Write a protein that binds this DNA or RNA. Structure first.
Ligand code: D3T
Ligand code: MG
Lengths: 69, 218, 1006, 437, 57, 65, 57
DNA sequence: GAATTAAGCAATTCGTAATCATGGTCATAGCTCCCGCG
DNA sequence: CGCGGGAGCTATGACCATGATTACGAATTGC
């Protein structure tokens, strides 16, 4: 918000924020592999719903910036 | 500036290097028609049938085309008269003098203009006869005029009856101006404004206009 | 003084004289001179304001002058069309005079001479000799053509003289050159004023040795040394080439009525005059009838540009600079203009013209004896064949094998010919005068006396073959009707296209109706819709199809709607539906539907959404009166066609009525043509719109129409599609047919005016008589005013590839079940000239095979496709490897022109490369043969690219080299393409087309 | 034949052919500068020249990128040093660039479309063009429906004297600073602010172009910085009787100026987002760019109309509103005194012969469309998908046939106002019946 | 339910990131839009690996 | 097992996955701390302490000297 | 109840790792020993950061 | 020496060329871990 | 213990080759 100039640094900042969330979901995946290899019984229907809604969110945020000309 | 050998009365044709793609065909056409051509006393002498082949064609953007030489005293260069007694070059000089305002001249010459090659379609005629050697010069005239119109931008033809079919004698489209003959009745060459039309069509082709005052002989 | 007009012709000199070539009853040729004027039509105020007085001025009466300018209007306050009624004067001067605001300048001075003096160019006149002043023997001067040409007596026969000539020239190369190669033979068919038909060939004795000259003298050929020793009664005369050319000069200088050649202006007469100027310096001097001026024979080009595209040069004709009145007629140019054929060489025209069916009486080892009469072919076919066979030498059997005539006999009602032919199994064969099984250049290499006499026979066959083509095409009657109808000189009849031959009778009616058409604004061209072409509903038709075609549809439309440039009240256009509906309401209340026709058209511009043209039918238009004149001419020649007995006279009058039909369709097309003086975009657009409504109305009555209990019921009512009229609109129509007949009619195809009505019956006779009842009932109840249809044909086994492409068996209205049907191909591969003979033969063979496999009905369509594609693959591989079919089966034809948007077009480049490389030149408008020729080491090429680079122009002297071969893959791809459009099982067709030609085949969509 | 030439050749050598060729050359030299009428006249002259002579050097054009960059060059955002001499300073304004070339029309840059202008401004343009024929085009600026003549680029004559002459004809003019610098001076931003305040205009001046007396191809100068600030809302501001200008509003409260509605759509700006904006010392200029949204043009127009209000519609460069269209709007369109009845209206048009001739020249539908201020193409698209019942050239009943055109918000808004269009149409129809029938 | 609140915080933070994309994405240049597009492709391939992990187990 | 190259290779390869999972546990613990929920890590601290004791025994054992 | 069983499986895998390192550790050789030592220092740096994140509260 | 011509559109097929879908490849920006020296 | 050099990998936008689509003119014919 407010006023900004030379928006490439804000683009780099939000790319860094996406780097943080990419490492965050890689952390979730690499501890999910460990908790699945532990042998505990888990029910992930609401987890699957959360991943489906977040993937729809990712597609909605992607589709504005995919294709040029 | 190459040269070839022919079997009849010119005995050689000195030609510029721009005339190279049409020379061997001109050699065979002139060798087949020349033994019948040269029985008649031709209006230029046979040694000067091919003077305009010495001229280059890349620097030429305008072809000024007549159908034949003058019936008498043809000098091999089209619309050239050292005595300046020919009616056609007189009306050409009158039109250029009306164009440019240069009224103090002794004669005119379309050969000494940069970018203009004066051309005779049929390269000769019998003495005192007009288009009498069309029989001999038909194939040569077609070949050499398509060779000219491959190079020049604007073709200017001095005859309505002589050059009504000149879009059929050529097959590649060129800027063609079929103008009135200078010896036409009712002064349609006096009302002719074709040299301005030549210059404007050159400027439409992004070409240099012809400075028509270069042809005046002082 | 009773004369018959032969030819009209103008003086070549600056002093303009108009001449008439005329013949009296005793056979004397009489010339009448007229002072030819430049005719101008000015108003009365312009006439009295002329500061130089006119030489002659005649009052033309109070004539209305109408501004034919098409202004669109966005409202219904159309200003009245500018009609300036004034006294008009016919201004005549011997010199050309530039008059400001002089009207009616589109017409020529010669038409103004004819119509203002009341002279028909095809007329017989008793000339008042008090207006004739004798100049010299046979030539008179007429100062007053009004009262001298006042008594128009009925027609009487005259003894016309003719000179049919063909020449033969030596050539070492492919073509003769007049500077190096002599004339070998000059043949002449001399027809005198006494009717004496003399045939004689002059043989160049310079090309023969002296012992051969003496041997021909012992054989009976006459040796002459000059023109005085020349006898026209001798059949074969030996002479030098100089004496031959002076005999040619003496014959061409004679005042014949017609000197007729084939390709003779371009080659024969030009070669004669060029060789005469070369060898002795003489010129063929045509003199005026009053002998004041004398011109020399100079063949001059006349180059037609196209009127479409970039308007490049499309055709050239060659004519004789003659002023003696002889109509020097090149038959090559005439058949080029009038016919539509693969080749226009003399052998091709003779093959297409003089074809007769002939049965076999005797068979031999090397001799086949054919006879033809009125039972083998139609009446007059065998008589024409015998007339050609009188001088003929070679007869082609079944259009592929050429047979020399051994013995010839002219019967009373046909011919009897013995042919050097292999033994043939069938009983009847098509005999034609086609290609010649000689090589002329080889005969010129080993030139002896026997070769000279054989080529003299072929030359006299060509010279008389000019006469046989002259009489076959009926150029006498066509010239007479073109002089009468188009109001033109007889030499000027065929050598002009539509606009000129319109300008005569249009001038006649404009003087008759006191109407003047003038233009002020610039004519603007828009694309408008044409005739409506329905899609074919079925690919095969096992049922009979009734063919209903409007009688002169676009002329009857223009007469019905009064569609003329000056009867157009206005064009009402709308950009929006609000203004469209408001203009619709004020259109109905303003213009009454009987007096005015409001024709709804598609818009000329994208912003417009409606376009209504209003035409006043109260005063008959100039275009309807012109169309009434041309349909009167077409109706009288159709009546003469129905009264004709011989096949040649039937062909003549069918061509004559077809010519008048095309002229009427040109009265149409000139209003769609922007450069025409009769250009009316609204009228041509409204004509297509009304014709489209006529095909939709005739389809709507006929599609879904059933016959039941002798009562004819159409699907829709018989309402006029434009207004409400007094006639009955009830579709329930009483027939004259029996009660037990209960058939259904449905439209399956439409094309502009034709509607293809599929009756569920298969009987020929019953379909013909029910379709005749349909034609009568449609013309009595469905159609209105001048709209008539006629029933032409019953289409049994109608095989339709696409729109405008169909094959059928024709059962005409005068035919029956027992009458033999004729195979009509319309736009298929058999008719198209860009389709090779091998292609046409294989399409005919495989269409016969497909008809057999569909008539058997015992196997599925996929097995039919498998067997047809397997047989096709076997035939294509056998043709590719064995190469038994010659080059002649693969010669495609194309017309040479310069009307190309691209200057680097491959076709024009190919012809110009041919004209550079070869002594034979292909003129503009010439049809040349080209074939796809590739080197012989090239294998079966899968992907076909740079196809136009493989085109090679084939002429008569072209031999396919050992290193070269026919590029079979292009022809095979086109052939396989049309077969896979014929077949079902599209996936297998794609697979086979990919394994042979590497590409996806194009399939037509219904 | 030989009485009719080897081929029919026209008079290709007359003075009329020379005049046509010279006109063809003049239209070829101004192909990038002309309206579509002069492009069609050029194509007609090319077709005539190709029919007349077998070839000509110029070819037909189908689409022409209308640009005036031949007399301009690269704009530099950096400070630079001036050359000494006598200079002619001009302000460059924010609005849409138009050119009034020899084709007698107002040509839009980047589209080449001829734009409809008021008759007094058009008459002043004809007076300027007929005063001297050496001028290639008149560089015009359309901002808030104000036609100011920014520049008059002439090939032979100096542009100083034409500006006061155009100001004599009622054309709107800027102020000028014709000062001889005669020394090397660096254009700092403080000097730029001095120069902009010396232009003494409250109108938005976005760049400065200078002319040399002895040199052609004048150069435009712009100093700015590219910024990106947050957008709170998009509002409209009334600039006429019915038209409104778009103006986006920041969170802070600064008003970034928008060129047209087409500029508003093309940038694809919505609320609560950042914009590519040029920054100036006096005001704010939104940069011209194509937005990178995934939505189409129609969805952008849908969102814009849903934001600013349903009764606004896209009317050319401006938003026009929906209201009651009575006799006062018809008198405002006809530029006459206000009338309450039809009788006083037709008497008032009977008083004014120029207004009566104007009513003759253009139809009832055009008068009713221009009174309502509808766009031409959108209203034609609307009416072409409706149905009408007509009694004495009056709409007694209307109904829409195809509702696919109602997805356009402009067409739907005009369909909402179509009852007032019917009222105005019937009123103008009655005026036409009473005055001239 | 540590993973549940962890992914809920991921949803909320990525909602903030996507509305900042919606704020700035109209006026991005080509190279930075290309970079954020590669970031979104890494986003999609990482979430499809996560979906494969929660599907196959 | 000869030359101990494969043994050293697949104990270096496993340590990358181990430190990846350790940083993963750190990142998801940062996630659940920033989510705002209250958690207790007493048994986690005990596991950290005994893991630290065994890995510093590994530090004492790993040295080459 | 996912992080505690996850770190229980982690510490069991590390029990296996420490036992196999103690099995092979009769010979280690210097460069690979320095490599696993520097990997261990990076690992205990990660452990120290994790301990800071669990003691910060 | 000049001299004025000149029918329309619909529809199909075929070759050529401009345009685009699909796919292979090639620099290229991340990218992430190994090695190393202070 | 900590950060720079380097090298293998992994997508990824851009560019180019090849084949299928389609406009576009030409030829031809039906009208
Ligand atoms: C052949 C041809 C036709 N037309 C137009 C004009 C009318 C329609 C229908 O003519 P058609 O020959 O089928 O039948 P039509 O001549 O109308 O009537 P007939 O059955 O011949 O009496 O097509 C044309 O413009 N140019 C042409 O060359
Ligand atoms: Mg018909």
């Amino acid at each position: 918000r407010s006023d900004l100039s030379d928006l490439k640094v804000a683009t780099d900042n939000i790319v860094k924020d996406l780097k943080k969330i990419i490492t965050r979901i890689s952390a979730v995946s690499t501890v999910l592999e460990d908790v699945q290899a532990a042998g505990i019984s888990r029910q992930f229907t609401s987890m699957t719903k959360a991943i489906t809604t977040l993937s729809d969110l990712v597609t909605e945020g992607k589709s504005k910036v995919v294709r040029k000309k | 500036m190459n040269s070839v050998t022919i079997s009849h009365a010119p005995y050689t044709i000195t030609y510029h290097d721009d005339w190279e793609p049409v020379m061997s065909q001109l050699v065979e056409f002139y060798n087949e028609v020349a033994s019948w051509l040269l029985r008649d006393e031709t209006s230029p002498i046979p040694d000067k049938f091919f003077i305009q082949l010495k001229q280059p064609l890349r620097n030429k953007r305008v072809c000024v085309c007549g159908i034949d030489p003058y019936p008498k005293d043809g000098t091999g260069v089209p619309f050239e008269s050292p005595n300046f007694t020919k009616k056609s070059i007189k009306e050409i000089a009158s039109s250029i003098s009306r164009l440019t305002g240069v009224i103090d001249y002794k004669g005119y010459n379309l050969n000494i203009i940069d970018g203009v090659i004066p051309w005779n379609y049929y390269l000769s005629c019998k003495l005192g006869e007009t288009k009498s050697h069309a029989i001999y010069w038909d194939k040569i005239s077609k070949l050499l005029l398509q060779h000219i119109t491959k190079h020049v931008s604007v073709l200017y033809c001095l005859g309505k009856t002589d050059f009504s079919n000149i879009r059929a004698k050529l097959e590649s489209p060129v800027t063609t101006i079929v103008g009135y003959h200078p010896a036409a009745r009712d002064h349609q060459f006096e009302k002719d404004r074709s040299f301005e039309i030549i210059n404007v069509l050159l400027e439409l082709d992004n070409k240099t206009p012809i400075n028509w005052a270069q042809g005046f002989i002082y | 003084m009773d004369v018959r007009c032969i030819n009209w012709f103008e003086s070549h000199g600056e002093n303009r004289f108009l001449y008439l070539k005329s013949r009296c009853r005793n056979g004397e040729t009489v010339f009448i001179r007229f002072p030819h004027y430049f005719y101008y039509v000015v108003t009365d105020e312009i006439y009295q304001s002329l500061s130089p007085p006119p030489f002659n001025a005649r009052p033309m009466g109070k004539m209305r002058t109408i501004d034919i300018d098409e202004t669109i209007s966005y409202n219904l306050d159309i200003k009245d069309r500018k009609c300036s009624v004034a006294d008009m004067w016919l201004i005549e001067e011997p010199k050309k005079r530039s008059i400001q605001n002089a009207t009616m300048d589109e017409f020529f001075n010669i038409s103004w001479f004819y119509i203002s003096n009341g002279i028909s160019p095809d007329g017989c006149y008793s000339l008042d000799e008090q207006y004739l002043t004798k100049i010299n023997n046979g030539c008179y001067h007429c100062d007053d053509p009004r009262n001298c040409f006042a008594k128009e007596i009925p027609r009487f026969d005259i003894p016309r003289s003719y000179l049919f000539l063909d020449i033969e020239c030596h050539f070492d190369k492919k073509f003769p050159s007049v500077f190096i190669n002599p004339i070998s033979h000059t043949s002449y068919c001399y027809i005198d004023l006494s009717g004496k038909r003399l045939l004689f060939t002059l043989i160049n004795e310079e090309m023969l040795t002296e012992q051969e000259i003496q041997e021909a003298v012992d054989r009976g050929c006459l040796r002459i040394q000059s023109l005085m020793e020349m006898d026209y009664e001798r059949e074969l005369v030996l002479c030098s080439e100089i004496v031959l050319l002076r005999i040619a000069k003496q014959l061409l200088e004679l005042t014949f009525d017609y000197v007729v050649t084939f390709n003779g202006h371009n080659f024969d007469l030009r070669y004669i005059t060029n060789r005469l100027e070369l060898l002795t310096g003489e010129k063929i001097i045509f003199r005026s009838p009053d002998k004041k001026e004398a011109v020399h024979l100079c063949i001059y080009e006349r180059n037609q540009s196209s009127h479409k595209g970039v308007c490049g040069m499309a055709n050239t004709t060659f004519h004789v600079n003659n002023n003696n009145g002889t109509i020097f007629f090149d038959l090559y140019s005439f058949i080029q203009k009038s016919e539509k054929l693969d080749s226009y060489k003399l052998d091709s025209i003779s093959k297409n013209a003089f074809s007769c069916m002939g049965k076999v009486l005797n068979r031999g080892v090397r001799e086949m004896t054919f006879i033809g009469d009125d039972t083998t072919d139609a009446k007059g076919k065998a008589d024409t064949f015998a007339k050609v066979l009188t001088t003929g030498n070679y007869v082609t059997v079944d259009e592929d094998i050429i047979c020399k005539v051994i013995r010839k006999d002219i019967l009373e009602n046909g011919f009897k010919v013995v042919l050097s032919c292999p033994t043939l199994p069938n009983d009847i064969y098509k005999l034609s005068f086609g290609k010649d099984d000689i090589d002329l250049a080889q005969m010129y290499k080993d030139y002896n006396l026997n070769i000279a006499l054989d080529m003299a026979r072929y030359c006299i066959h060509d010279a008389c073959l000019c006469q046989y083509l002259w009489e076959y095409y009926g150029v006498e009657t066509k010239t007479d009707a073109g002089a009468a109808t188009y109001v033109l000189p007889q030499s000027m009849v065929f050598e002009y296209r539509a606009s000129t031959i319109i300008k005569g009778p249009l001038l006649k009616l404009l003087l008759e109706t006191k109407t003047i058409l003038v233009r002020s604004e610039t004519k603007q061209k828009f694309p408008y819709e044409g005739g409506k072409v329905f899609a074919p509903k079925q690919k095969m038709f096992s049922n009979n199809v009734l063919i209903f075609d409007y009688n002169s549809l676009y002329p009857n439309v223009c007469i019905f709607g009064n569609l003329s440039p000056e009867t157009l009240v206005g064009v009402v256009v709308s950009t929006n539906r609000l203004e469209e509906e408001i203009n619709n309401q004020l259109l109905l209340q303003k213009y009454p539907p009987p007096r005015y026709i409001t024709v709804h058209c598609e818009p000329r511009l994208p912003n417009l959404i409606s376009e209504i043209a209003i035409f006043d039918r109260s005063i008959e238009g100039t275009i309807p009166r012109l169309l009434r004149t041309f349909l009167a001419e077409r109706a009288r020649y159709k009546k003469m066609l129905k009264q004709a007995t011989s096949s040649t006279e039937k062909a003549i009058y069918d061509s004559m009525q077809y010519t008048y039909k095309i002229v009427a369709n040109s009265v149409y097309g000139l209003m769609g043509f922007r450069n025409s003086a009769l250009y009316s975009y609204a009228s041509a657009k409204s004509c297509t719109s009304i014709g489209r409504r006529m095909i939709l109305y005739l389809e709507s009555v006929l599609n879904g129409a059933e016959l039941s209990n002798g009562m004819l019921r159409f699907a829709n009512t018989l309402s006029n599609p434009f207004y409400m009229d007094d006639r009955d609109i009830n579709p329930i129509v009483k027939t004259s047919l029996p009660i037990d007949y209960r058939f259904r009619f449905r439209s399956v195809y439409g094309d502009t005016d034709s509607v293809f009505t599929e009756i569920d019956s298969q009987d020929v006779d019953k379909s013909i008589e029910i379709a005749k009842e349909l034609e009568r009932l449609i013309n009595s109840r469905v159609l209105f005013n001048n709209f008539k249809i006629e029933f032409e044909a019953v289409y049994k086994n109608l095989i339709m590839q696409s729109k405008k492409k169909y094959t059928t068996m024709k059962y005409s209205a005068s035919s029956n079940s027992k009458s033999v049907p004729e195979r009509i191909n319309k736009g298929t591969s058999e008719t198209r000239r860009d389709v090779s003979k091998f292609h046409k033969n294989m399409i005919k063979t495989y269409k016969t095979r497909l008809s057999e496999m569909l008539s058997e009905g015992r196997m599925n369509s996929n097995q039919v496709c498998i067997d047809i594609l397997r047989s096709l693959e076997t035939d294509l591989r056998s043709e590719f490897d064995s190469r038994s079919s010659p080059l002649e089966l693969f010669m495609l034809s194309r017309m040479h022109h310069s009307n190309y948007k691209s200057a680097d077009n491959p076709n024009m480049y190919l012809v110009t490369e041919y004209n550079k490389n070869n002594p034979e030149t292909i003129e503009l408008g010439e049809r040349y043969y080209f074939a796809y020729i590739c080197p012989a080491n090239v294998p079966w090429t899968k992907k076909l690219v740079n196809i136009k680079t493989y085109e090679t122009i084939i002429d008569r002297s072209f031999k396919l080299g050992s290193n070269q071969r026919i590029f079979y893959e292009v022809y095979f791809k086109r052939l396989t393409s049309e077969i896979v459009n014929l077949l079902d099982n599209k996936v297998l067709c794609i697979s086979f087309f990919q394994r042979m030609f590497g590409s996806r085949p194009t399939f037509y969509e219904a | 034949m030989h009485h009719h030439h080897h081929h029919g050749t026209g008079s290709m050598t007359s003075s009329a052919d020379l005049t046509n060729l010279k006109e063809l050359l003049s239209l070829y030299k101004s192909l990038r500068f002309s309206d579509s009428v002069a492009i069609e006249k050029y194509n007609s002259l090319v077709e005539w020249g190709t029919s007349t002579y077998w070839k000509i050097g110029v070819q037909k054009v189908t689409n022409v990128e209308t640009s005036i960059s031949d007399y301009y060059d690269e704009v530099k955002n950096k400070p630079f040093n001036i050359d000494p001499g006598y200079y002619i300073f001009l302000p460059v304004y924010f609005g849409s660039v138009f050119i009034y070339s020899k084709g007698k029309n107002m040509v839009e840059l980047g589209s080449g479309n001829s734009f409809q202008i008021p008759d007094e401004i058009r008459s002043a343009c004809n007076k300027v063009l007929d005063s001297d024929n050496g001028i290639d085009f008149l560089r015009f600026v359309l901002l808030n429906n104000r036609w100011i003549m920014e520049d008059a680029i002439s090939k032979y004559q100096s542009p100083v004297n034409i500006f006061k002459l155009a100001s004599e004809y009622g054309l709107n003019i800027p102020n000028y600073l014709e000062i001889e610098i005669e020394e090397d001076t660096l254009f700092d931003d403080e000097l730029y602010s001095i120069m902009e305040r010396s232009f003494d205009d409250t109108f938005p001046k976005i760049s400065i172009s200078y002319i040399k007396l002895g040199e052609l191809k004048r150069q435009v100068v712009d100093f700015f910085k590219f910024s990106f600030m947050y957008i709170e809302s998009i509002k409209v501001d009334r600039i006429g009787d019915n038209i409104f200008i778009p103006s986006v509003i920041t969170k802070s409260g600064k008003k970034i100026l928008v060129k047209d509605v087409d500029h508003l759509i093309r940038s694809k700006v919505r609320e609560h987002t950042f914009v590519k904006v040029k920054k100036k010392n006096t005001f704010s200029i939104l940069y011209d760019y194509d937005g990178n949204g995934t939505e189409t043009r129609g969805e952008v127009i849908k969102r814009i109309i849903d934001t600013i209000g349903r009764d606004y519609y896209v009317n050319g460069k401006y938003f026009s509103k929906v209201g009651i269209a009575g006799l006062k709007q018809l008198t405002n369109k006809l530029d006459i005194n206000e009338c309450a009845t039809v009788d006083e209206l037709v008497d008032e048009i009977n008083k004014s012969g120029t207004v009566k001739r104007k009513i003759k020249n253009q139809s009832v539908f055009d008068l009713s469309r221009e009174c309502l201020g509808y766009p031409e193409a959108d209203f034609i698209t609307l009416v072409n998908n409706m149905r009408f019942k007509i009694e004495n050239c009056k709409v007694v009943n209307f109904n829409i046939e195809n509702t696919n055109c109602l997805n356009n918000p402009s067409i739907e808004t005009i369909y909402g106002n179509f009852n007032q269009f019917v009222s105005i149409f019937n009123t103008v129809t009655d005026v036409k019946k009473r005055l001239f029938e």
